[PDB]
Amino acid sequence: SYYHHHHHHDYDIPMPPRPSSGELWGIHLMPPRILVECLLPNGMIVTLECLREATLITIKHELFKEARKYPLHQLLQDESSYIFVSVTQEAEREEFFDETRRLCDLRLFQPFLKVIEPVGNREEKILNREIGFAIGMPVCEFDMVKDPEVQDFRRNILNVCKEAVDLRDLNSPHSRAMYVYPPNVESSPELPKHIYNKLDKGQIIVVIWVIVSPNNDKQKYTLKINHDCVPEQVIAEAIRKKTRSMLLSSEQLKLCVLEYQGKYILKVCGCDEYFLEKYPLSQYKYIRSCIMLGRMPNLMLMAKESLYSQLPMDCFTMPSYSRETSTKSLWVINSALRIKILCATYVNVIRDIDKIYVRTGIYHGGEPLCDNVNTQRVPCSNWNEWLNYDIYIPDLPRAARLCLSICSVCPLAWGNINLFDYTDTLVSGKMALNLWPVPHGLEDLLNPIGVTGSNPNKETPCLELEFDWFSSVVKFPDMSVIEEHANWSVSREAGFSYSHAGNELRENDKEQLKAISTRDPLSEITEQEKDFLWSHRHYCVTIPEILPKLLLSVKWNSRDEVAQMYCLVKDWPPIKPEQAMELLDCNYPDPMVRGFAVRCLEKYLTDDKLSQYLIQLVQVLKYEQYLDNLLVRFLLKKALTNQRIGHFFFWHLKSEMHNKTVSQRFGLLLESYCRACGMYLKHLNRQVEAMEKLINLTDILKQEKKDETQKVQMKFLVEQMRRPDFMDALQGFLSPLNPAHQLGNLRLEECRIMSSAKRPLWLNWENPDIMSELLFQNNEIIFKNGDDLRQDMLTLQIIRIMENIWQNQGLDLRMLPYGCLSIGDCVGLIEVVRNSHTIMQIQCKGGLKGALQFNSHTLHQWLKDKNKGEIYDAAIDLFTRSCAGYCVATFILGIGDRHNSNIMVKDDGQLFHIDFGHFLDHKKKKRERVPFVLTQDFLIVISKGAQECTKTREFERFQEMCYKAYLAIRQHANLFINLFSMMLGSGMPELQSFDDIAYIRKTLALDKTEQEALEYFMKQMNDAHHGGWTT
Amino acid sequence: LQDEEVNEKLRDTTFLVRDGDYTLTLGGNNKLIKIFHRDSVVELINHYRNESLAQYNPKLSKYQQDQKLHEYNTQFQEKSREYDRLYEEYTRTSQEIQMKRTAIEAFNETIKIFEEQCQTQERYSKEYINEKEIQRIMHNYDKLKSRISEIIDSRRRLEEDLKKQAAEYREIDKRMNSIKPDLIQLRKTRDQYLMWKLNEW
Ligand SMILES: NS(=O)(=O)c1ccccc1Cl
Ligand SMILES: NS(=O)(=O)c1ccccc1Cl
Ligand SMILES: Nc1ccc2n[nH]cc2c1
């Protein structure tokens, strides 16, 4: 009687991505002895069986044994002039120069090896294997590329490499150590006041250490010195003590110091940071972190000699790639725009679709004319029209692009083309434009926000076109010509008598500009306001911050308006890095705009604050029209100036090589970097070797050794990490989460496959540092192959940025934006945060015996057990502070519902969120949600012990932090809107439109007053809990 | 008169009535403007609609009609669920298809080394033509070509796996193109039955 006896006849009971890309083709793990077909100059294939982990020294030296039996020997030179070579899974013929490499790490396709002699006696150059390893594609794959844009980028972008490398040897070796160990420093020297108030009105207890022969021994020399003190002075007061005796006068001790003083610099104990320059000990992050955490710095006097004997020189050298028509100016062509649409092929659809047609529009991001569709013809079943557009050629703006698609009676396959060559040339001729499938849940008809260019997949709907030919090669005009036209149109302006511009007065409509100057990027501007703005453009120059709105007010399909804007922008005054970033989203494509934006960054963007926003800045490369461009030369330089940038710059590109829309642009960039970066290439290639071993191990677990209990999986885990190729590969390298940290020597004792079904690995290495005792002896992190990290990556970024906007507005909410890095297609590393457990783990550890209920006070009781005594108060504060900051951020970003298994509480009483899920309230808009709900459990801890906990004095002070913090973010809403906007490039399903980012606007309620915003907040915070939140 | 969400819900087109204290969201793109009660109010509204508005650069709908139940959401969302799992099949297969092509590229190239090796023995078989050493030498050649046979036959097997995979691929893309417009109709007639909280389907 359950389903009205109705049968379901269909019901029979019966990543990314699949098995392959391992040690042999379609294999994963090659068995421990393998049969390898060897080939020679003879024609004589012997067939050595050999060990999977065996070096190529061996297989050679035991083939130059095993040959002396097989036929036609006597013609094989001293093996000392001979090299192996085979085909790899990325089908390339790879001469195997390094022969200390093991058979398993060759990434062969079939197990065979041809033998040969070394051609092109420049093995030394043919180690840009190392480059291809890092980049994850062969370098030769660039060499055989037709596009001159590419072969140029490669040859041209070496300017920057060379110029950067000379900047490193400018004051060798100090300069080299600034490159290799740049200071880790908050961007303002001034210290916030809640930090100050731990310091005896401006003093810190330090501890300098030193190792003198027999070295066995190490010696404290604890000081107490000013927070604003530089390291050079802290070197002195360290030596001062160590030196002082009853046999040194203060005259003789001053001389003894100054001489010993210069010879040393300060390291941090247990990890590789170095305070190498004039900055307050406070401005370094390790100190200001020690201050706050309740810790005594453990620095270390390192001899300069012994640091300088780590750094090797660059040895940078150019690669082998080292070696009219007049023109028609765009503006002379008397014509309109006509682009011919011929024939597509390959299109997938007869019965259910009625008809199909090629829709096209000209673009800037927004539309410069009535785009028009072509008549429908032979729908399905396999056009030839010159198609006429409503724009005069000369009005075409420089970043003008044709966007196209093929649509149904919904779309089918989209594409776009730059109307100009990277050489400022207007395109004429016939184009074959291979199309991209529509992104899942693109309901719009054309994709102009999409990437510029054809597909590199041949096997896709191609579409043939012809671009009007105007009797000659047509170029965009030089500034010389664009300037003149501005100054002409200006004086032609000054002489009519009628109302409308779209008058050297002023007024105080003057301030109805400044009103606009403060609105957020997504506050849509009205046509009247456009005309308002465009008309007073010459006044706007006293309010630079208005420029983004002005530029959106310009009519880019009038070359008149654009010529004049070009000239404003020429010597517009620099604006703040936080604003100029807006000017490199998809809404601003023009080269002069973007150039300006880059100058702003060259000028006023700290190596610190670049490091903070490096992810945005890299996603923005994608929206650039051409390969070479100012923003790349900018970032490539910074990357080569400052290894801590380069490091993440390299991972941030590498992580996205899988994604074939960027592949070439990024690979090519990565190649530039890997050639010029120096010895780091060797450290990266060790990181890269490691991550590959981890991916291939997790893959075996995920899709072969499923089930097999835990215990069988874990016997197979330890077996593998015992093997010598793994011990080689996973043991002496830098943490990509932070390469300051060194990993050395796996502790397999403590390595395990976490419980989750994506088989995350918990890895724990020794900390090889010489003073590891004072920091941590066991660095451990989580390698998770399965989930896509780059959303988590971002919310943690955003969370980090809030924490700063708080601190440096004096407002100590302590968030824990733990470390997370995407390093490939759904593959990453997540920092472990030691001594933390989930609220649900707390509920089991205090859960009284047989199962009835946990108890709401078990959390608050659990904290007392940790924080006993005078500390208790402090540990409640921490909870209360963190619990606020997370309550605000989580509401603001709209991240997925917090529950017991995704909140964590540390032993010291700090609370922090993990596994955030979708950020901007992605699919639950099918509203105004509060994802972190303060249950009783927390409320108790906040109101120490109280019953009827909603109305305590503690809880009101908690609400006060929330109100102050929410408003703090709101004041800086611009930044977040942009940070979000720049990330439209990355393929994140949570971010496809600006109207996605919408949510953050409702959330902060920018359209209302802040009175109304607060009260919006209070309301929503009241709505979530029912009780509390009325004032 | 009375008898952000704009930019979201106005998905395509040319008239909209929001809330100067009100706002018009129509020409080109999705263009917006507003003035206070300055010159009639809601009868000059009827004018711009079809004629003039030449006091500006270019001069050039609501309510619900067209015929209450849950019904559609199980259709909509469990047709979506297929579209979604078809994006995944689509997705896998695409990555699978190139995985093959570049695995054929492996074969094609692998072979050329074994073709070059039959020929490296060809040269050295000719160059050194007792009748035992010749037979041993004749045998090692025999493996080459019976090995090469398998390599090529292996390639072919993949090559035809690629054809099925290609046809099977294209067919997923085919079936999604029927689902898209079907799936949009069902979302639009969901948002009209929204017009008429309570919810509970
Ligand atoms: N059309 S095609 O891709 O050249 C082709 C057709 C049939 C068989 C092999 C190939 Cl590569
Ligand atoms: N480059 S190498 O010496 O062959 C090597 C191989 C495997 C692991 C580490 C290293 Cl340094
Ligand atoms: N010290 C610094 C740090 C960052 C800089 N950008 N441009 C010049 C700079 C100097």
CSV table of C-alpha atoms in Angstrom, one decimal, chain A residues 171-317:
chain,number,residue,atom,x,y,z
A,171,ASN,CA,74.8,45.3,-5.3
A,172,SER,CA,75.8,41.6,-5.2
A,173,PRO,CA,75.4,39.7,-3.0
A,174,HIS,CA,73.0,41.8,-0.7
A,175,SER,CA,70.8,42.3,-3.8
A,176,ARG,CA,70.7,38.6,-4.5
A,177,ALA,CA,69.6,37.8,-1.0
A,178,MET,CA,66.9,40.6,-1.2
A,179,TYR,CA,65.7,38.6,-4.3
A,180,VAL,CA,66.0,35.2,-2.7
A,181,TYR,CA,64.8,36.2,0.9
A,182,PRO,CA,62.9,39.4,0.6
A,183,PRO,CA,61.6,41.0,3.8
A,184,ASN,CA,58.2,39.8,5.0
A,185,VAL,CA,56.7,43.1,6.1
A,186,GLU,CA,53.2,44.7,6.8
A,187,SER,CA,52.9,47.8,4.5
A,188,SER,CA,52.7,50.6,7.1
A,189,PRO,CA,55.4,51.0,9.8
A,190,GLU,CA,52.9,52.5,12.3
A,191,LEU,CA,51.6,49.9,14.8
A,192,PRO,CA,47.9,49.6,15.8
A,193,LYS,CA,47.0,50.4,19.4
A,194,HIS,CA,45.6,47.0,20.6
A,195,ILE,CA,49.0,45.6,19.6
A,196,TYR,CA,50.8,48.5,21.2
A,197,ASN,CA,49.1,47.8,24.6
A,198,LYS,CA,51.2,44.7,25.2
A,199,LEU,CA,54.5,46.5,25.2
A,200,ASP,CA,55.5,48.8,28.3
A,201,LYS,CA,54.8,51.9,26.2
A,202,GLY,CA,56.9,50.6,23.3
A,203,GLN,CA,59.2,47.7,24.2
A,204,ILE,CA,59.3,43.9,23.3
A,205,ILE,CA,61.3,41.2,25.0
A,206,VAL,CA,63.2,39.4,22.2
A,207,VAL,CA,65.6,36.4,22.4
A,208,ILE,CA,68.6,36.5,20.0
A,209,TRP,CA,70.5,33.2,19.7
A,210,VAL,CA,73.9,32.2,18.5
A,211,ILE,CA,75.9,29.1,17.7
A,212,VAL,CA,79.7,29.3,18.4
A,213,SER,CA,82.1,26.3,18.0
A,214,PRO,CA,81.8,23.4,19.1
A,215,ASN,CA,78.3,24.4,17.6
A,216,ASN,CA,76.7,21.6,19.7
A,217,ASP,CA,75.9,24.5,22.1
A,218,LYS,CA,73.4,27.4,21.5
A,219,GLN,CA,73.0,30.5,23.6
A,220,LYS,CA,70.1,32.8,24.5
A,221,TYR,CA,70.8,36.5,24.8
A,222,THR,CA,67.4,37.8,25.7
A,223,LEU,CA,66.9,41.6,25.2
A,224,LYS,CA,64.2,44.2,25.8
A,225,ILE,CA,64.2,46.9,23.1
A,226,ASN,CA,61.9,49.3,21.4
A,227,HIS,CA,59.3,48.1,19.0
A,228,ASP,CA,60.3,50.7,16.4
A,229,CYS,CA,64.0,49.5,16.6
A,230,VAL,CA,65.7,48.3,13.4
A,231,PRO,CA,67.5,44.9,13.0
A,232,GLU,CA,70.9,46.5,12.7
A,233,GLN,CA,70.5,48.0,16.2
A,234,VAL,CA,69.1,44.7,17.5
A,235,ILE,CA,72.3,43.1,16.2
A,236,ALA,CA,74.3,45.6,18.4
A,237,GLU,CA,72.4,45.1,21.7
A,238,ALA,CA,72.9,41.3,21.1
A,239,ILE,CA,76.7,41.7,20.7
A,240,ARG,CA,76.8,44.3,23.5
A,241,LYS,CA,75.7,41.5,26.0
A,242,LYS,CA,77.7,38.6,24.6
A,243,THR,CA,80.8,40.8,24.7
A,244,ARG,CA,80.6,42.6,28.1
A,245,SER,CA,83.2,41.8,30.7
A,246,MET,CA,85.1,43.1,33.7
A,247,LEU,CA,88.1,43.6,31.4
A,248,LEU,CA,86.4,45.8,28.8
A,249,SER,CA,85.9,49.4,29.5
A,250,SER,CA,82.9,50.9,27.8
A,251,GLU,CA,85.4,52.6,25.4
A,252,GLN,CA,86.9,49.2,24.5
A,253,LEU,CA,83.4,47.6,24.3
A,254,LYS,CA,82.2,50.2,21.8
A,255,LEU,CA,85.1,49.4,19.5
A,256,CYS,CA,84.6,45.6,19.8
A,257,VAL,CA,80.9,46.0,18.8
A,258,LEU,CA,81.1,48.2,15.7
A,259,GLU,CA,83.6,45.7,14.1
A,260,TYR,CA,81.5,42.5,15.0
A,261,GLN,CA,78.3,44.4,14.2
A,262,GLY,CA,78.4,44.4,10.4
A,263,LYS,CA,79.3,40.7,10.1
A,264,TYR,CA,75.8,39.4,11.0
A,265,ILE,CA,72.1,39.5,10.1
A,266,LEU,CA,68.9,38.2,11.7
A,267,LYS,CA,67.2,35.0,10.8
A,268,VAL,CA,63.9,33.7,12.3
A,269,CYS,CA,64.5,30.4,14.1
A,270,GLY,CA,63.1,27.2,12.5
A,271,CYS,CA,62.1,28.6,9.1
A,272,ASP,CA,63.8,30.7,6.4
A,273,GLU,CA,62.8,34.4,6.8
A,274,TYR,CA,65.5,37.0,7.1
A,275,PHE,CA,65.2,40.6,8.4
A,276,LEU,CA,67.5,42.1,5.8
A,277,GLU,CA,66.5,45.8,5.8
A,278,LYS,CA,65.7,49.1,7.6
A,279,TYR,CA,62.3,48.5,9.1
A,280,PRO,CA,61.0,48.5,12.6
A,281,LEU,CA,61.1,44.9,14.1
A,282,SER,CA,57.2,45.6,14.4
A,283,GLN,CA,56.8,46.0,10.6
A,284,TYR,CA,58.1,42.5,10.1
A,285,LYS,CA,55.1,40.0,10.4
A,286,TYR,CA,56.9,37.4,12.5
A,287,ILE,CA,57.2,40.0,15.3
A,288,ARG,CA,53.8,41.5,15.1
A,289,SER,CA,52.5,37.9,15.1
A,290,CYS,CA,54.7,37.0,18.1
A,291,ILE,CA,53.4,40.1,19.9
A,292,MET,CA,49.7,39.1,19.4
A,293,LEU,CA,50.1,35.4,20.0
A,294,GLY,CA,51.9,36.0,23.3
A,295,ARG,CA,55.4,35.0,22.3
A,296,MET,CA,59.0,35.9,22.6
A,297,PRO,CA,60.7,36.3,19.2
A,298,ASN,CA,63.4,33.7,18.6
A,299,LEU,CA,65.8,35.3,16.1
A,300,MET,CA,69.3,34.0,15.3
A,301,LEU,CA,72.6,35.8,14.6
A,302,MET,CA,73.7,34.4,11.3
A,303,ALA,CA,77.1,35.3,9.9
A,304,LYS,CA,76.7,37.1,6.5
A,305,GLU,CA,79.3,34.8,5.0
A,306,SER,CA,77.3,31.7,5.9
A,307,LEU,CA,74.1,33.1,4.2
A,308,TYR,CA,75.9,34.5,1.1
A,309,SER,CA,77.4,30.9,0.7
A,310,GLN,CA,73.9,29.6,0.1
A,311,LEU,CA,73.0,31.9,-2.9
A,312,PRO,CA,74.4,30.9,-6.3
A,313,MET,CA,74.6,33.4,-9.2
A,314,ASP,CA,71.9,33.6,-11.9
A,315,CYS,CA,74.0,32.5,-14.9
A,316,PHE,CA,71.2,33.8,-17.1
A,317,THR,CA,71.7,33.6,-20.9
